[PDB]
Amino acid sequence: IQKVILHDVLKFLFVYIVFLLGFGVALASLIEKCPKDNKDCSSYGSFSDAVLELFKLTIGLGDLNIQQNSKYPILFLFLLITYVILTFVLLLNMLIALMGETVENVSKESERIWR
């Protein structure tokens, strides 16, 4: 666990941040007027809400409907399906990067530094 939370996951965050914060603005700005007659107009409102409602998406949690008040419902989705794919690709770089670590190291690495 320790050699794994030092070497691979720390990378994955650092690139998972920049996309989340990156794509976060893109969908947090495409949203437009919140008519006060219809308050809590959209989940993606301020930037703080965009980061989380994307965060809930990654873990496999919540609900989604491509109707949120925006200027471009066609562009408002292309940046979202984007975030699904681009996120997903790294998660496959995750399991293989640890796969390329465990078959070489564990049986000799763990038992010895344990001693």
Total residues at interface with a copy of itself (CB under 8 A): 38
- Sign of the CA dihedral with 33 first, then 69, 16, and 18 last: negative
Q: Is 113 in the site for a copy of itself (CB under 8 A)?
A: no
Distance set, CA 35 to CA 12, 40, 51, 81 (Å)? 39, 9, 22, 27
Angle, nearest 10°, between helix axes 9-30 and 75-114? 170
Q: Is 60 annotated as a binding residue?
A: yes
**3-class DSSP state for residue 56?**
helix
Binding mask 16-35 for a copy of itself (x = CB under 8 A): --------------------
Q: Which stretch binds ligand POV (CB under 6 A): 33-41, 83-91, 95-103, 106-114?
A: 83-91
Q: Is 61 in the site for a copy of itself (CB under 8 A)?
A: yes
Q: How far is the CB of 76 from a copy of itself (least distance, A)?
A: 13
Q: Locate tokens 């301020």: which residue? A: 46
Q: How far is the CB of 59 from ligand POV (least distance, A)?
A: 6
Q: How far is the CB of 5 from Na ion (least distance, A)?
A: 19
Q: Nearest 5 degrees, angle CA 105-CA 111-CA 112?
A: 85
Q: Is 35 in the site for Na ion (CB under 5 A)?
A: no
List residues near Na ion by CB under 5 A: 60, 95
